[PDB]
Design a protein around this ligand. Sequence first.
Ligand code: HEC
Ligand code: HEC
Lengths: 79, 78
Amino acid sequence: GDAAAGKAKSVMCAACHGAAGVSAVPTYPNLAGQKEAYLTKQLNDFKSGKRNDPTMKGMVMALSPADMENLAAYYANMK
Amino acid sequence: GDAAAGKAKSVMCAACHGAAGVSAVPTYPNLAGQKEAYLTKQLNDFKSGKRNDPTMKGMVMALSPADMENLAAYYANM
Ligand code: HEC
Ligand code: HEC
């Protein structure tokens, strides 16, 4: 959805996925420029438990449907 | 893993993930420049069934552990 709203919500995400969506640790994925619909589905799937990862299930706990779309827009538009 | 061997096993993967690791389709992820260790984990997780996606489970059933490392290195280093 809204890239700017996503930025506002990305401070925690940046600690692991990087300030510009490129991670510095090899087990944390890069998000910069990823497909927006794919990113949204992953966040939806962590929240629902469809994709089991204890760290990310925890990170999406407080995210609304709009928040996940917005975070996806923020990373997808990274160049 | 061995990027060169990976590239040689990548024809099927390229059909959805793109010839240069950037996909054309909104629900298919880009793999280009992704972290090698992360990509390797996901492939192992599709094969073990720990990550559920009917399409990718299918795609990994034929791959050895080395093939999966090799594909990961191929995408990670492009
Ligand atoms: C570490 C403490 C993290 C923080 C903070 C955030 N994420 Fe994360 N993320 C982390 C790990 C270890 C993984 C991989 C899980 C695995 O299967 O090995 C991820 C993965 C994601 C993904 C999936 C990417 C993909 O290519 O499929 C996304 C979309 C993602 N993370 C986004 C994201 C957001 C929006 C965060 C804050 C709200 C966030 N992550 C925090 C580790 C960590
Ligand atoms: C479509 C018909 C595909 C073919 C052929 C291959 N993959 Fe795939 N891939 C596909 C989908 C629909 C998804 C997303 C599943 C989801 O969770 O929505 C994926 C995902 C991957 C991943 C995970 C990437 C991530 O960021 O976590 C990887 C590492 C991957 N695909 C690699 C890969 C390889 C090596 C392939 C052939 C051997 C391959 N894919 C084929 C769809 C399709």
